Every structure is written in structure tokens, then in C-alpha cells.
Amino acid sequence: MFNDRVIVKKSPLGGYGVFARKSFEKGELVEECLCIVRHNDDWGTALEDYLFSRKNMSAMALGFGAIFNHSKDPNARHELTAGLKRMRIFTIKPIAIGEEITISYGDDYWLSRPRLTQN
Amino acid sequence: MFNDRVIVKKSPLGGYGVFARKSFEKGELVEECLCIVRHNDDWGTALEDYLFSRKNMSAMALGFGAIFNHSKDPNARHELTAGLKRMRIFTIKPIAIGEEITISYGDDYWLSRPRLTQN
């Protein structure tokens, strides 16, 4: 799909990842809806699908997991679920009006009053 | 997305559900890829996302769960996962070259040699 906030690239075409079209400082906000994350061993055995875990984060995807594979480093964190986590994404790295985004990046519980002025 | 086999409607637009464009008798076959189903209580606590369970079936979705909400009755069964269940969908009700489809319908372990002649 695609939204003025960020362009998502999940369809095969020589490039998998979620790009953002809006330069900004460390502290942006992205949106999506294709992740099922939790925190437990029974999870890796329960959500057996496109698992994507890092140290403590244990989640799974199904079309976006591969979109997150191409990530030499933690570009930004994400929170899309109904139990824990949340329904929003944060980018601790400045955006370049056309940069790529990924997920999984430790935790760092904190915020800063997001301000998505329209787009 | 959309496929000659069936047209999927997940994008908001005053209508959520998976429609089928191919009249047939009770015993059709649909295809998809957005469901994570299992059978256990720890599941409802592990897959906490868009849960969709019925009597014994305990599953969760993320874009298709709402597409299954609009279902006054069990239109057809489904099986899309890697652990149990399978990767195909069956329609025990005749198709009307433009009918809507849903999921969750008891179990009835059985088959009948599906014959998806192209489309």
C-alpha cells in the first residue's frame, strides 16, 4: 500500500522495506498494520510464522517480516498490536525525505510528544 | 489484493470481506495468506492481536480479522498457517459468481478432491 506519511514496499520488485518520504529530526512517527509481537518462549512456539526476534523482543510477521529483513541496523522501533506494545511506529533517526525504515531496536522506554503535522 | 480465483476486500471502503467471482457447487476452494490459527488457551494469551475464535477454533488476524467480522453465518472454512491447519480454503456453500466469503465453521474433518480448473 502507500500513504502520505510513508510509502510501504511489500510487493516483490527488487527491494523490500518500508520507506519514508518526509525529512525530519530523530523522533518521527510511522504507521502500519502487519505485526504480531509479544515477549515469551511459548510465543516463538505459538506464533511460528515469519518470526523476528532480537535479544528479548519476540514477534512474527507475514509479508512485512521480509520487508524488515533488509536492515543493516535498527532504523526505527515499531508498535503494532492489540495486547502489549501499541499501534504506532517511532523513528529515532532523522528522516531524509526518502529513506528506508525497519524495526527491532532494543527498547528504550521513552517518548517525546509526537507531532505528525498532517504529513 | 485480488486474484482470478477470488477478489479480497481488506482496504476500508464501506465493505469488509473476501468475495468470490466463480459460481460453483458446495465444495469450492479459495486462497489467501493472513491468518495465524491454533488450538489452546495459552494461544489467546500469546497471539493477542485480532483474535477470532469459535467454540474450539482459536486464531488471530491483522487486516483480515475485520474482513471476517461481517459474517452472519459460516460461509466457508479456511486453513492458512505453517503449524496445524494448512494453506488452502474450502467453501461448503455453492458460489454465486460474486458472493462474499468468511471463515470459522466448526471443523468437519473431510475433503472431496478439490478441482480448481484454472479459474
GROMACS .gro file of C-alpha atoms in nm:
model
  238
    1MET     CA    1   0.000   0.000   0.000
    2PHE     CA    2   0.110   0.365   0.032
    3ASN     CA    3   0.026   0.668   0.250
    4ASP     CA    4   0.134   1.035   0.251
    5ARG     CA    5   0.303   0.952   0.584
    6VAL     CA    6   0.530   0.679   0.442
    7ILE     CA    7   0.548   0.453   0.134
    8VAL     CA    8   0.539   0.079   0.216
    9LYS     CA    9   0.716  -0.168  -0.015
   10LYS     CA   10   0.595  -0.525   0.045
   11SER     CA   11   0.532  -0.638  -0.315
   12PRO     CA   12   0.828  -0.819  -0.474
   13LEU     CA   13   1.016  -0.586  -0.709
   14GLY     CA   14   1.389  -0.591  -0.623
   15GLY     CA   15   1.354  -0.403  -0.292
   16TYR     CA   16   1.185  -0.493   0.039
   17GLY     CA   17   1.139  -0.240   0.322
   18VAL     CA   18   0.920   0.050   0.440
   19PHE     CA   19   1.045   0.385   0.305
   20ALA     CA   20   0.957   0.730   0.444
   21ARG     CA   21   0.909   1.047   0.236
   22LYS     CA   22   0.948   1.330   0.490
   23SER     CA   23   1.287   1.454   0.618
   24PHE     CA   24   1.286   1.526   0.993
   25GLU     CA   25   1.492   1.506   1.314
   26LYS     CA   26   1.534   1.195   1.532
   27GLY     CA   27   1.177   1.148   1.658
   28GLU     CA   28   0.942   1.083   1.363
   29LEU     CA   29   0.630   0.863   1.356
   30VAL     CA   30   0.529   0.596   1.102
   31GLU     CA   31   0.212   0.384   1.073
   32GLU     CA   32   0.133   0.029   0.955
   33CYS     CA   33  -0.065  -0.287   1.043
   34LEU     CA   34   0.119  -0.616   0.982
   35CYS     CA   35   0.298  -0.728   1.301
   36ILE     CA   36   0.219  -0.962   1.593
   37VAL     CA   37   0.475  -0.913   1.873
   38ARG     CA   38   0.492  -1.040   2.234
   39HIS     CA   39   0.755  -1.145   2.491
   40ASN     CA   40   0.782  -1.515   2.587
   41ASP     CA   41   0.927  -1.852   2.478
   42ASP     CA   42   0.584  -2.011   2.426
   43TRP     CA   43   0.545  -1.729   2.171
   44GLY     CA   44   0.821  -1.848   1.934
   45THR     CA   45   0.638  -2.183   1.951
   46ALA     CA   46   0.289  -2.028   1.921
   47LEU     CA   47   0.333  -1.757   1.655
   48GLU     CA   48   0.551  -1.987   1.436
   49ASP     CA   49   0.525  -1.785   1.112
   50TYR     CA   50   0.769  -1.509   0.999
   51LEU     CA   51   0.933  -1.475   1.341
   52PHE     CA   52   1.151  -1.169   1.400
   53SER     CA   53   1.307  -1.152   1.747
   54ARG     CA   54   1.605  -0.960   1.889
   55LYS     CA   55   1.754  -1.034   2.234
   56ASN     CA   56   1.420  -1.001   2.419
   57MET     CA   57   1.171  -0.886   2.152
   58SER     CA   58   0.987  -1.190   2.009
   59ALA     CA   59   0.748  -1.118   1.720
   60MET     CA   60   0.632  -1.257   1.385
   61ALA     CA   61   0.521  -1.111   1.052
   62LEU     CA   62   0.364  -1.226   0.723
   63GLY     CA   63   0.469  -1.005   0.431
   64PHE     CA   64   0.643  -0.735   0.636
   65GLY     CA   65   0.889  -0.974   0.807
   66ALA     CA   66   1.083  -0.993   0.479
   67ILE     CA   67   1.039  -0.615   0.444
   68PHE     CA   68   1.224  -0.588   0.778
   69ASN     CA   69   1.498  -0.837   0.678
   70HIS     CA   70   1.685  -0.576   0.470
   71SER     CA   71   1.810  -0.380   0.774
   72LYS     CA   72   2.185  -0.349   0.838
   73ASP     CA   73   2.091  -0.165   1.159
   74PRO     CA   74   1.793  -0.067   1.376
   75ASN     CA   75   1.646   0.217   1.167
   76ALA     CA   76   1.343   0.271   1.394
   77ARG     CA   77   1.119   0.099   1.652
   78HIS     CA   78   0.758  -0.011   1.595
   79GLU     CA   79   0.443  -0.098   1.793
   80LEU     CA   80   0.152  -0.259   1.603
   81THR     CA   81  -0.067  -0.499   1.805
   82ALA     CA   82  -0.363  -0.519   2.046
   83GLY     CA   83  -0.207  -0.676   2.358
   84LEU     CA   84   0.124  -0.515   2.457
   85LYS     CA   85   0.331  -0.264   2.255
   86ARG     CA   86   0.086  -0.028   2.077
   87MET     CA   87  -0.035   0.089   1.733
   88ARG     CA   88   0.232   0.339   1.623
   89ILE     CA   89   0.593   0.350   1.499
   90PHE     CA   90   0.879   0.581   1.605
   91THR     CA   91   1.195   0.677   1.413
   92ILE     CA   92   1.486   0.766   1.646
   93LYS     CA   93   1.692   0.857   1.336
   94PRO     CA   94   1.640   1.174   1.130
   95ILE     CA   95   1.444   1.112   0.808
   96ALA     CA   96   1.581   1.203   0.462
   97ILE     CA   97   1.260   1.270   0.262
   98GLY     CA   98   1.314   0.926   0.104
   99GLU     CA   99   1.493   0.693   0.349
  100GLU     CA  100   1.421   0.327   0.432
  101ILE     CA  101   1.280   0.208   0.767
  102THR     CA  102   1.292  -0.123   0.958
  103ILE     CA  103   1.217  -0.241   1.315
  104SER     CA  104   1.360  -0.419   1.623
  105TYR     CA  105   1.589  -0.185   1.821
  106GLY     CA  106   1.628  -0.277   2.190
  107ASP     CA  107   1.353  -0.098   2.386
  108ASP     CA  108   1.443   0.236   2.549
  109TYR     CA  109   1.104   0.301   2.714
  110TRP     CA  110   1.052   0.673   2.645
  111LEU     CA  111   0.872   0.929   2.426
  112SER     CA  112   0.870   1.298   2.329
  113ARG     CA  113   0.517   1.407   2.231
  114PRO     CA  114   0.499   1.306   1.863
  115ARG     CA  115   0.383   1.582   1.626
  116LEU     CA  116   0.279   1.437   1.288
  117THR     CA  117   0.165   1.769   1.139
  118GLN     CA  118  -0.061   1.616   0.870
  119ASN     CA  119   0.227   1.491   0.652
  120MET     CA  120  -0.512  -0.756  -0.334
  121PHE     CA  121  -0.708  -0.952  -0.598
  122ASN     CA  122  -0.676  -1.282  -0.787
  123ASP     CA  123  -0.875  -1.451  -1.068
  124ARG     CA  124  -0.968  -1.710  -0.803
  125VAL     CA  125  -1.134  -1.461  -0.565
  126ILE     CA  126  -1.135  -1.084  -0.501
  127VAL     CA  127  -1.018  -0.988  -0.149
  128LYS     CA  128  -1.154  -0.671   0.013
  129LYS     CA  129  -0.938  -0.561   0.309
  130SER     CA  130  -0.898  -0.189   0.230
  131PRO     CA  131  -1.156   0.033   0.402
  132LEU     CA  132  -1.429   0.136   0.158
  133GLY     CA  133  -1.772   0.059   0.309
  134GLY     CA  134  -1.741  -0.321   0.283
  135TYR     CA  135  -1.511  -0.574   0.453
  136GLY     CA  136  -1.493  -0.940   0.346
  137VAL     CA  137  -1.343  -1.177   0.085
  138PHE     CA  138  -1.568  -1.210  -0.222
  139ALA     CA  139  -1.555  -1.489  -0.482
  140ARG     CA  140  -1.620  -1.448  -0.856
  141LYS     CA  141  -1.697  -1.803  -0.976
  142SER     CA  142  -2.034  -1.975  -0.926
  143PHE     CA  143  -2.000  -2.342  -0.825
  144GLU     CA  144  -2.148  -2.620  -0.609
  145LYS     CA  145  -2.076  -2.673  -0.237
  146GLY     CA  146  -1.705  -2.762  -0.248
  147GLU     CA  147  -1.505  -2.468  -0.390
  148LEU     CA  148  -1.150  -2.360  -0.297
  149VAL     CA  149  -1.020  -2.012  -0.209
  150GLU     CA  150  -0.666  -1.888  -0.134
  151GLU     CA  151  -0.514  -1.621   0.093
  152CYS     CA  152  -0.231  -1.555   0.342
  153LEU     CA  153  -0.329  -1.352   0.651
  154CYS     CA  154  -0.426  -1.586   0.936
  155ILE     CA  155  -0.249  -1.740   1.239
  156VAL     CA  156  -0.468  -2.013   1.394
  157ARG     CA  157  -0.400  -2.277   1.663
  158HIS     CA  158  -0.589  -2.460   1.942
  159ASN     CA  159  -0.505  -2.377   2.306
  160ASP     CA  160  -0.571  -2.127   2.589
  161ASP     CA  161  -0.209  -2.007   2.600
  162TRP     CA  162  -0.281  -1.908   2.239
  163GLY     CA  163  -0.546  -1.645   2.319
  164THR     CA  164  -0.282  -1.506   2.558
  165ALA     CA  165   0.007  -1.548   2.310
  166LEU     CA  166  -0.143  -1.434   1.976
  167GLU     CA  167  -0.321  -1.136   2.142
  168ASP     CA  168  -0.395  -0.939   1.822
  169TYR     CA  169  -0.715  -0.965   1.610
  170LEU     CA  170  -0.832  -1.287   1.778
  171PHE     CA  171  -1.113  -1.479   1.607
  172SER     CA  172  -1.218  -1.797   1.789
  173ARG     CA  173  -1.533  -2.012   1.774
  174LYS     CA  174  -1.608  -2.287   2.031
  175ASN     CA  175  -1.271  -2.465   1.983
  176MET     CA  176  -1.101  -2.277   1.697
  177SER     CA  177  -0.866  -2.011   1.840
  178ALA     CA  178  -0.696  -1.785   1.583
  179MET     CA  179  -0.595  -1.423   1.523
  180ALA     CA  180  -0.574  -1.192   1.221
  181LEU     CA  181  -0.440  -0.845   1.131
  182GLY     CA  182  -0.639  -0.687   0.847
  183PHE     CA  183  -0.847  -0.993   0.757
  184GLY     CA  184  -0.996  -1.038   1.107
  185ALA     CA  185  -1.222  -0.738   1.039
  186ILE     CA  186  -1.283  -0.879   0.688
  187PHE     CA  187  -1.420  -1.189   0.865
  188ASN     CA  188  -1.631  -0.989   1.114
  189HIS     CA  189  -1.906  -0.923   0.857
  190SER     CA  190  -2.035  -1.283   0.858
  191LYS     CA  191  -2.393  -1.357   0.971
  192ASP     CA  192  -2.306  -1.726   0.925
  193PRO     CA  193  -2.016  -1.962   0.848
  194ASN     CA  194  -1.979  -1.904   0.472
  195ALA     CA  195  -1.672  -2.129   0.434
  196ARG     CA  196  -1.377  -2.280   0.626
  197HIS     CA  197  -1.011  -2.176   0.589
  198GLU     CA  198  -0.660  -2.312   0.656
  199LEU     CA  199  -0.368  -2.068   0.624
  200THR     CA  200  -0.067  -2.137   0.851
  201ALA     CA  201   0.254  -2.341   0.886
  202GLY     CA  202   0.190  -2.548   1.201
  203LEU     CA  203  -0.156  -2.711   1.203
  204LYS     CA  204  -0.446  -2.647   0.964
  205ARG     CA  205  -0.298  -2.594   0.613
  206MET     CA  206  -0.261  -2.341   0.329
  207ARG     CA  207  -0.596  -2.357   0.147
  208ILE     CA  208  -0.962  -2.254   0.192
  209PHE     CA  209  -1.280  -2.455   0.124
  210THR     CA  210  -1.634  -2.329   0.052
  211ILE     CA  211  -1.902  -2.579   0.164
  212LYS     CA  212  -2.166  -2.345   0.012
  213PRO     CA  213  -2.228  -2.306  -0.362
  214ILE     CA  214  -2.069  -1.990  -0.506
  215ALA     CA  215  -2.272  -1.724  -0.692
  216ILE     CA  216  -2.011  -1.573  -0.931
  217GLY     CA  217  -1.994  -1.277  -0.690
  218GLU     CA  218  -2.070  -1.390  -0.333
  219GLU     CA  219  -1.894  -1.298  -0.007
  220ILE     CA  220  -1.683  -1.542   0.198
  221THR     CA  221  -1.581  -1.562   0.566
  222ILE     CA  222  -1.429  -1.826   0.799
  223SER     CA  223  -1.477  -2.019   1.126
  224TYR     CA  224  -1.728  -2.304   1.080
  225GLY     CA  225  -1.691  -2.591   1.330
  226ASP     CA  226  -1.448  -2.845   1.181
  227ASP     CA  227  -1.598  -3.143   0.993
  228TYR     CA  228  -1.268  -3.317   0.909
  229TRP     CA  229  -1.325  -3.425   0.547
  230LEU     CA  230  -1.250  -3.344   0.181
  231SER     CA  231  -1.358  -3.425  -0.176
  232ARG     CA  232  -1.062  -3.386  -0.416
  233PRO     CA  233  -1.070  -3.012  -0.494
  234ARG     CA  234  -1.064  -2.925  -0.866
  235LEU     CA  235  -0.974  -2.558  -0.919
  236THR     CA  236  -0.972  -2.576  -1.301
  237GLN     CA  237  -0.754  -2.265  -1.353
  238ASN     CA  238  -1.027  -2.016  -1.255
   0.00000   0.00000   0.00000
